[PDB]
Symmetry: D2
Amino acid sequence: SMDEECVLEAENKKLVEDQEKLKTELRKTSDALSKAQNDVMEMKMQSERLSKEYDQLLKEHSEL
Amino acid sequence: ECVLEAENKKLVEDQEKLKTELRKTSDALSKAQNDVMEMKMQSERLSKEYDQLLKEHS
Amino acid sequence: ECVLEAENKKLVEDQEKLKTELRKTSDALSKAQNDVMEMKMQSERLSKEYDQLLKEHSE
Amino acid sequence: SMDEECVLEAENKKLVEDQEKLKTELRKTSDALSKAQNDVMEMKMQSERLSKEYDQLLKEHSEL
């Protein structure tokens, strides 16, 4: 026989479940930002090699 | 001219690598922003739930 | 009823604090994103003028 | 052909300068990203605090 206790339990359960979801979303967010961090580092190194290649190219070929 | 040609090929393909890397970075940040929208809505849900709990039972 | 009032005040302040942190975070991300798009434009200007350099002074 | 040395000089300076600008932008970008990552860590800590308070609240007050 359903009573108000029944509904109370449902509401509390919902509060807890949404806390869990916010936790999950936080983790997905940090994961994405860590991917971005790695990508930025990749760009840093790639850019340093590229800059060395530019330097080298202009040094060997004075007409450029 | 030979060495210049090879060097140029290398330089261009590395530029392409940088371009790809840029796109990937942008995409990652976009994913993070979407996630933050989600968290704003989720936390609004949490505080509304709490408020409702209080209004009903206190 | 008293302890409930105190705990509630505390809880509310922490919710608003979290809200502010979320806004702060989206702002920070928008800053980063703008920075990345700026690097995209810059790298395009760089490769473009490199192309012009080789087109003008090479075969 | 003095003009030639001119244009070539200007163009080289511009290539170098734009390399430098990309370098600077990469450094600042990494800074901004690090800022956002720490902001997310702060929200994790804050939301765990909120979770502890919700738990305590529902535990002490059965009518909630």
